[PDB]
Design a protein around this ligand. Structure first.
Ligand SMILES: [Cu+2]
Ligand SMILES: [Cu+2]
Ligand SMILES: [Cu+2]
Ligand SMILES: [Cu+2]
Lengths: 125, 125, 125, 125
């Protein structure tokens, strides 16, 4: 019932070799799992997020975002990443994102708490 | 059952006068509503996110993040914000965040799709 | 000859206790020194940057930015910070910035190369 | 006399078709011109910046950054971009950056003052 519900739902892979498994709900919900190929991470982590379920029809992408807190049954990296981006449909469908990864720190170390980067997700690798 | 479940759960206010209403689950879930005092927004929007439910005990903050897609029954701003940050407990409890706000754009306009900023949330105003 | 040449030129202090000493040129140049109160840094480092020497007259701030590479005669932290922001004049003059601090890394570690934060500079402390 | 003085100096092109012309000084200076293929920009703009003139010899990139204020003899976009990144040498030499583009705004509009993105520069197109 959301415009790109089918387009977004499924398995995505980024340039680092990480795996993003998501279900898009009719209501705008994103739920799934994230497995990072890098960093202080092992196996799957819960993710949740939101997307625009009624995007513009003028060729614009579909805005979305999601969060992973880096705690699961195996490890806790005392940190959380949020990806903010847009889904672009078509033959080479993509989710183009920028992300913010904040670590829990002391107040004295808060200036160095947050990494920033960019991930591009595709349906194939 | 999460360490800062009680600390995080409730109503928070930022420097712009926005209102963030959240429930923290034992499992690491964040669910609630966001009302922005600024921008192309009216009333409450659904949010979801994650937090570290077993933070370090060395005085470090608690990593968390959440997403709002700016669609509700009143408006659709074809955009999504993610906040990434940490909760700092104590007498003047705070959630210190940085955020990324991505708009759905054409591919030609994607270079100007994403705003970045920083919000500090407190329990009082 | 630039509108805020006099306003910008001088000594500024941020929330971390760092010291930013700058001269604004008529042509839009920023030159000076930066001393960080935190991180892998000691004493003064060269900075250079640019500002809008003919800002809007509608109450808007003055856009500017500058760079420090963290090499001087004492230390080399193999990294560079850029601050991007605006100068806001008046009785409590401020330079409000966001910054990106990139470390030289191997290609395998490039995903974790860049910190992001925000500094507010004032004329007094 | 700087390790990558020769490597950095010259003409670079990004994924948008913008042109970055830079001279790297022995002392860590970057000077040159920037021509954007997009946005409120026409012709060349002055840039200045800094780079690590004595990088690590362990295969790490070379940290650098620079600023453009978007005022020249043709236009004034009341804004400034800073790029923060690293130079990676070799057969396919690259400068991989993230950037912050701040517009001069009123205090009421400062929350929406800053765009963030990422540019990759190469020696060929
Ligand atoms: Cu619409
Ligand atoms: Cu631990
Ligand atoms: Cu004007
Ligand atoms: Cu070294």
């Amino acid at each position: 019932m959301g415009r790109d519900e089918a387009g977004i739902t499924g398995t995505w892979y980024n340039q680092l070799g990480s795996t993003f498994i998501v279900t898009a709900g009719a209501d705008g919900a994103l739920t799934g799992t994230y497995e990072s190929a890098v960093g202080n991470a092992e196996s799957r982590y819960v993710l949740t997020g939101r997307y625009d379920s009624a995007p513009a029809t003028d060729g614009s992408g579909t805005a979305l975002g999601w969060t992973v807190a880096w705690k699961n049954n195996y490890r806790n990296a005392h940190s959380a990443t949020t990806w903010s981006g847009q889904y672009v449909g078509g033959a080479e469908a993509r989710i183009n994102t920028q992300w913010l990864l904040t670590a829990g720190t002391t107040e004295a170390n808060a200036w160095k708490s947050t990494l920033v980067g960019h991930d591009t997700f595709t349906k194939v690798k």
